[PDB]
């Protein structure tokens, strides 16, 4: 009895870590903003942080206001804040600078400073009630989620081959168990109904399950819903519906949320807000088909 | 010299390193596969390698054959080979010749094993004539390309080690040589793509990476279409930004690619799409090809 929406998640009062991910270009940033907006509107008494773990940030471009290492409120909302981690500035901040910049260019520093962001938030609880992650594409996001488990094993052996580390050692374990708690942490997969997206999404979900990451929600984005004389739209819709049936069959225990390809561009608090409502209440192509042209330009 | 095609690059005989990158979902893999095919077809006398530096590989999905850490020829081609580096398998291999799984799960390892592939490839030349890189999305490709500059600075201050330091400098000078290395940006004519592509090209130039080719992918060309409320609306949006791209990048090769009605997968359909990287796509003439997949 898994409704085709994220209503249970949007109105969830237990989730503390919500990951939004998937193949590149499927709509991770657009979806993670929509989820963040919906939770913020649905639960006005709780504070929400939307962090981008993708090095090439798109949160600022999406809302139209500049974000940085320090969490700032989203203009027009009272309980949603964004954060785009800057490897360069952040390292300059901790040092206080050429060599600092040099360490800042090393691969992995992005996931490390992100984990460090998570880690300092847990210390805060022991701020924001829930944290949504606009993750990088599949490949590097997995390594990030492996970071708790990787640090835990690495840490004890570190101790040996070598007090402050022991406190650190407890915190990593705390993160490790919360990411494996279905009530606390979940991963929302975004995808499009295309051939190359199917196999990577499946491949992503399986690997996430092997990490004990809870995943029960799939957003199928950029759907045409064409069904009346356009050759390309009908051809591509014919393609989309076929794979859409295959997804519904494989993921019958999942929340499979279907989102339309809008005629306008989803930008600003308003259009994101106007789009996100279809993550809460399912999109009806016959009824709500007008909303795809009502986007402000 | 600014022709809206990659004919000059496909028939290039000096380039040894070709990077294909850009924002996610714009079509890096499809384009990097298409470029590799065109070069292979244009230069029968040369062997070409197509490496994927993206951890979530799509070369196998795109061609329909399993590739791995060991380079394999593409079925149906005599001079084109792909390689999908697998971090877990590679590290166990290094251990069995001379902790490995853990280091294989550490963030950045993918960029490290990619550079090692490049680094050991250079050692071989001192083999494939040209190597095409299907890079990861904008954020992490930058980390990878900074690695030569990064390793040099880290390595020199730290102090066979000299031979390694010599190899890094060799890569560093070759990646900054416009005749040897270039970066091809792929993008779509959409707002969020406009600012990330620009941001990426500017950062690449600061690394002394040559970039003079931009692929604008998934264009509708609706006015040229058979003849729709949404398509004309989205093309109207695409054409607006497309004019802006033409204006800003007048020094670049701006190659425009149509949104096909079929799916570009397998050697045949990839080839048929790749031809539009050599001779520009004419919506009035070549409009039938988008349904022949």
């Amino acid at each position, epitope marked *: 009895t898994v409704e085709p929406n994220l209503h249970s998640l949007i109105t969830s009062t237990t989730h503390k870590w919500i990951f939004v991910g998937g193949k590149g270009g499927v709509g991770k940033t657009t979806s993670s903003c929509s989820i963040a907006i919906q939770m913020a509107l649905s639960q006005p008494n709780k504070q929400f942080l939307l962090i981008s773990t993708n090095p090439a940030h798109n949160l*600022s*471009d999406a809302f*139209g*206001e*500049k974000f940085g290492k320090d969490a700032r409120k989203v*203009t027009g909302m009272n309980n949603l804040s964004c954060m785009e981690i*800057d490897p360069s500035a952040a390292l300059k901040d901790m040092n206080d600078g050429a060599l600092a910049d040099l360490t800042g260019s090393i691969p992995g520093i992005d996931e490390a400073l992100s984990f460090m962001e998570v880690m300092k938030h847990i210390k805060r609880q022991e701020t924001f009630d829930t944290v949504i992650f606009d993750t990088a594409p599949t490949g590097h996001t997995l390594r990030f989620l492996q970071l708790p488990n990787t640090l835990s094993k690495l840490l004890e052996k570190f101790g040996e081959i070598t007090g402050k580390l022991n406190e650190l050692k407890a915190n990593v374990e705390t993160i490790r168990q919360q990411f494996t708690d279905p009530d606390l942490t979940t991963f929302v997969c975004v995808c499009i109904s295309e051939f190359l997206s199917l196999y990577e999404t499946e491949r992503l979900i399986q690997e996430l399950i092997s990490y004990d990451m809870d995943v029960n929600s799939i957003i199928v984005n950029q759907l045409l819903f064409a069904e009346h004389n356009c050759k390309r739209c009908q051809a591509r819709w014919k393609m989309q519906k076929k794979y859409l049936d295959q997804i519904d069959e494989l993921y019958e225990d999942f929340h499979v949320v279907k989102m339309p390809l809008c005629a306008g561009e989803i930008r600003g608090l308003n259009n994101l807000t106007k789009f996100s409502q279809f993550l809460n209440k399912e999109y009806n192509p016959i009824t709500d088909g007008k909303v795809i042209y009502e986007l402000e330009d | 010299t600014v022709e809206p095609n990659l004919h000059s690059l496909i028939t290039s005989t000096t380039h040894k390193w070709i990077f294909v990158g850009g924002k996610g979902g714009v079509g890096k893999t499809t384009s990097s596969c298409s470029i590799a095919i065109q070069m292979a077809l244009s230069q029968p006398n040369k062997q070409f390698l197509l490496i994927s530096t993206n951890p979530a590989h799509n070369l196998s999905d795109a061609f329909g054959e399993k590739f791995g850490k060991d380079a394999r020829k593409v079925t149906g081609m005599n001079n084109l080979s792909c390689m999908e580096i697998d971090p877990s398998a590679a590290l166990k291999d290094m251990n069995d010749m001379a902790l490995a799984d853990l280091t294989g799960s550490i963030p950045g390892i993918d960029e490290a094993l990619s550079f090692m592939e490049v680094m050991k490839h250079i050692k071989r030349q001192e083999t494939f004539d040209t190597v095409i890189f299907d890079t990861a999305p904008t954020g992490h490709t930058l980390r990878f390309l900074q690695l030569p500059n990064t390793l040099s600075k880290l390595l020199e201050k730290f102090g066979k080690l000299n031979e390694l330091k010599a190899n890094v400098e060799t890569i560093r000078q070759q990646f900054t040589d416009p005749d040897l290395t270039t970066f091809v940006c792929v993008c779509i004519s959409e707002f969020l793509s*406009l*600012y990330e592509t*620009e*941001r990426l090209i*500017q950062e690449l*130039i600061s690394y002394d990476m040559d970039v003079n080719s931009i692929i604008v992918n998934q264009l509708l060309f609706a006015e040229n279409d058979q003849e729709c409320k949404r398509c004309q609306a989205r093309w109207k949006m695409q054409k607006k930004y497309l004019d*802006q*791209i033409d*204006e*800003l*990048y*007048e*020094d670049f090769h701006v190659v425009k690619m149509p949104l096909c009605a079929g799916e570009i997968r397998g050697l045949n359909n990839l080839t048929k799409f790749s031809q539009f990287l050599n001779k520009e796509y004419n919506p009035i003439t070549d409009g039938k090809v988008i349904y022949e997949l």
Partner: antibody
Amino acid sequence: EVQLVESGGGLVQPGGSLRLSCAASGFNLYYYSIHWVRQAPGKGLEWVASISPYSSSTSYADSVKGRFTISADTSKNTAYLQMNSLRAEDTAVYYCARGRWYRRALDYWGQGTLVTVSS
Amino acid sequence: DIQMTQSPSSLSASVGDRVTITCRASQSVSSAVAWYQQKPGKAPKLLIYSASSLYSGVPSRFSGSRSGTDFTLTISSLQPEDFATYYCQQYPYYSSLITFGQGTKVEIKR
């Protein structure tokens, strides 16, 4: 309708500091670039600084480099020019202008604000 | 170091005359050049961008052209409201810098 309004101009002594504001309306300052251009009495136009919020980038003429600092506040849709160590040579009418990502031509200008540096 | 050499610093013309103002770039800047009109005490107005593209609302008597590093502003038939000072401007891709010409004052011939 797009318009820019400069403010903050006045009299300060050589070596002193002064902060200019350029308040924008009719467009979102984030997706554009804003530029300060000054004009000394009887002389031509001299670009001094630029800021692009969308690419976190800023740029300065060497004539003011290290003395001036340009910034933007997207929440209030306003740009600023922080001028320190001012000299008589910095005396001029200061304009702010926009500013496109695909076109570094200046299409909208403010009315200008007078900055006088003298003891 | 990059320079835009504008010429002449001043030129005299009468109503109905065809006026030509030139600006030479020290390096190649491609077509990244704009032209402005400024009347005394007032802010400059954009006339042309990309060397030869007429900005919105600017009279068609205004025209731009390029030949290498040489850029030309043309007024087909000078009108009384056209008497003022004009500035060439480059914004080449490779550079973050904006550099202006010395200006050209268009006066009334007598």
